[PDB]
Design a protein around this nucleic acid. Sequence first.
DNA 1: TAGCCGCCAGC
DNA 2: GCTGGCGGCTA
Length: 131
Amino acid sequence: MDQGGRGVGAEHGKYRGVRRRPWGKYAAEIRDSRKHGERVWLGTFDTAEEAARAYDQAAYSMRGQAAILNFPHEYNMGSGVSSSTAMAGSSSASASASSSSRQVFEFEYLDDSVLEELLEEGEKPNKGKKK
DNA sequence: TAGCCGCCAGC
DNA sequence: GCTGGCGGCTA
């Protein structure tokens, strides 16, 4: 976690789950508790705030419960299935000026969300249980 | 500009 | 040993 980072910095402005290149591009990669450190690449982001979130998805997936991530936002949607109010309300007003503006990925961020609930992307039944 | 690699390093 | 992130060559 902070461990890999100390050379650049024990703890600093950029987030956990993040790499920095000379141009400044940011890079998403994860390894598995269970596969002994093999690396699969979740993606690549410019963005540091949604960075933690790229790792969010991945790491909700891996721990399984009480996932180890920065921040605490929990989201509940009601009543539905039919929650246009909650999409629009939670979304507005959340924005990053430089990154979201790249275009098209505005559409996917603008309706939702900021923090999402996903389940065991990491495991394939049958696998009970992890470590 | 991006990805994979490889040591190494703090929790 | 955990799990990231440095880290810098090559892809």
